[PDB]
């Protein structure tokens, strides 16, 4: 019953095998049960007090990890550097002699034995950001059809028809940018494309969730910035190496950068710090250089289109610049339909007029509420934009509208309904509740604007030809 | 006199056992 | 029979030899089977239960790596320095005492035995700078017939006719710089140069698999920055030392620096801790040097030549300078001809217009699209510029055209053609597809401008004579 263990090193024609055991190298004879032909270098074997190899086993799974330095000419050995800058030449085991063991890979190794087995880095923490795949799909996004069509053509279409693209000698777009006013739905598309990619990977390759999620990376913005000089660039290089490794000309890898302005700037706008002055060239070289990413798509989302560096906002890097505009009446109706589901409880007062037809009643309520909020009445007057020319312009609450505001209004209406059912005991959302929620929201978001706001007024000022000099809230 | 951040550079240390 | 191993130390006349085993040196006799004369210093021998040398093999193949410092006077001892700067004296092995033992080389050593078994060439420069050879050739570059001539001469002519160069005592230039607006062909020229050099080296010598491309050292901008204080300078010195060693009279060594903006920044004027005052002087001293570096050419690519240090741009160090500009009408036609190959499928109507003449139809399409792009019409008015006094100057898209956006236009036209094929079923590409692609590309790119003054803005201000003070988009 008491049996030892050891590490196989090499094989000979004398039916003998070299085994490292107890800190010493010995040569031993294999039992007749085991055949030496199937043995491979680095395999773990079982020993005994009689010192005979009895059975082979899987390779070692734990130990110190050492960054690979270089691959020797023979191919059976490689130079690897330890944690404290110690360099050793170690044999390469069977599994490493799949993806080539390219230099710069921290290989799992045993210093005493002198053999390698595996590797990995910290960029996987990005994959840990998307531990839960969002369940929102394209069916849950309303008011945007051309934008969804473009984003599907940029990502899903090239991989849906490989032969047609090959015949026309067309490659999938290298990058996609999404820009627009806050709350217009950029992150919704950003997470819907990730959900679709996860579904595709689950249905095509395998049902395992981790591998499916491994094809989407979430940067989160300034997560790359680090304390030490030259470490953020190394992190970016590792991220792009990880991206290029997973690509196979039929499996896209989507690296999503959120709030592009956080880490990318014009290299001169940095006042307190100029880390972007070094970060930007590294990413530019990674995206397009002597060696270019064959099958990697970079999706960036930002709220300040102009503040990004011109080099990034160039064809060949960010091919399609999708613009998401503030919802109009039709988009508002679509969003309300997406939120005011048919299954929500509705008061019998509302169903009395429409014989209990829930769908027709909800559609009529949605049309009434969107008409109420999209009304050019003196009660909806918000601001007076002036210019040097003098063409004073009256803006309404409808101009500063987005899907987030619609969701907030629906939530407030639901809260009012729940308060009413708690106090009185009659359930059901009412039409008057939505109107009250609208006016309360427009009252709550009244004293927001500051002295000067370059958020969305720059475009209007350029349209009118003159710059804004005064704005006032026109209430009471 | 705009306030500015900093990025440090580590110095290697010699440790045995 | 389990038998341990050991390492031979010395040979004595009594047929007894010293063997290092189990971490200690013991004087052991040799079996009559083995010959004491056949044994060599540092050769691994076999032991047994009686600790008798029975079989002698080869020298050790794994262990630590220590750089050789100095061979002692006797020649049987060598002093080396370890990873943590420990100085140790070892005995050379029989093969060490063709290949030449030189100071500074790395040796495979074992601390316990204190022997050096082989010399392992580190060749660390072969790592982190080698890449797969791109397939771009000189024939794939259009609109640049003067700059390509300059760079081709500066790279080939000193090596095409060496005797004539030596007759005039003309040294080959050692500094080539490429600068221009983004997406104009700098990296394209670099890739073409790398491909041509790799093909030439594969023609001249063998080892086509590897080392053939070793003569092109591609370095990304921030790739050389390191966390430690002196590691980056040592990396610079090592790269330049290898470039000096690898260089020959007939074999050029091209060390390409991509994204020249990051490194070589003007000394000082850095708000963050991006200390260039240490790295930049190292590069200057390596390139210029107390002794002239021979058979080396450094190529740098950047779109921001203003932030580069004046010293590195001094003539003689980076004398050869090349400017790549925005393509004109003729250059745009050349680029379109480069991309719109005759092999691209064409619609039946277009072929029927010219009776199936492929070249005539292609050139007609190219001429029409080029004329539409560069026409000065109201719809192509991109930007409006107001100077200090100046006038209302109008910049059209022809003032911002580039090869990258031409490629993007062709790509999206092909995508539209594929969409039409999928929806209608008629293969081919229409001129209307090109026009729709052009208008869509301009609509997507008309959000680029920002309140900044790059080199193009400086050129425009110099032409007008007044500084740029206002820029606005012509949305309506
Ligand atoms: N069709 C729609 N258009 C816009 N917003 C919608 C739509 N449907 C739902 N929303 C709601 O709008 C909210 C904001 O969307 P999203 O998170 O995409 O904007 P965002 O990308 O965060 O904007 P920013 O990044 O500028 O803050 C979401 O919580 C979502 O519930
Ligand atoms: N004759 C040409 N002139 C300009 N661009 C071309 C030409 N032919 C092809 N291109 C396309 O232009 C694209 C960009 O070229 P290149 O990579 O050399 O510029 P770049 O170095 O990326 O510029 P930057 O580094 O400032 O962004 C290439 O992908 C290439 O396909
Ligand atoms: Mg967002
Ligand atoms: Mg470039």
Numbering used by the authors:
A (entry chain E), C (entry chain B): 97 to 193, 211 to 589
B (entry chain G): -1 to 15
Please give the exact wording used by the authors of the publication that reports this structure:
Proteasomes are present in eukaryotes, archaea and Actinobacteria, including the human pathogen Mycobacterium tuberculosis, where proteasomal degradation supports persistence inside the host. The bacterial 20S proteasome interacts with a ring-shaped AAA regulatory complex called the mycobacterial proteasome ATPase (Mpa) in mycobacteria or ARC (ATPase forming ring-shaped complexes) in other actinobacterial species.
To improve the local resolution of Mpa, we performed local 3D classification and 3D refinement combined with signal subtraction of the 20S CP (see “Methods”). This approach resolved two states of Mpa at an average resolution of 3.8 Å and 3.9 Å, respectively. The two states correspond to two distinct motor conformations stalled at sequential stages of substrate translocation. A stacked pair of residues, the canonical aromatic pore loop residue F341 and the highly conserved adjacent lysine residue K340, forms a spiral-staircase that encircles the Pup N-terminal segment by engaging in unspecific interactions with its Cα backbone. Interestingly, while in state A, all six of the canonical aromatic pore loops of the ATPase domain are in close proximity to the substrate backbone with one of them (protomer 6, cyan) initially disengaged, in state B only five protomers are in close proximity to the substrate backbone and engaged in interactions with it. The loop of the penultimate protomer (protomer 6, cyan), which was at the bottom of the staircase in state A, is retracted away from the substrate in state B and has shifted upward by 25 Å to a more distal position relative to the proteasome gate. Furthermore, in state B, the five pore loops contacting the substrate are shifted downwards by 2–3 Å compared to state A, which results in a translocation of the substrate towards the open gate of the proteasome by almost one amino acid. In state B in comparison, all protomers of Mpa are resolved with ATP bound, including protomer 6 (cyan) with its pore loop now in a disengaged and retracted conformation.
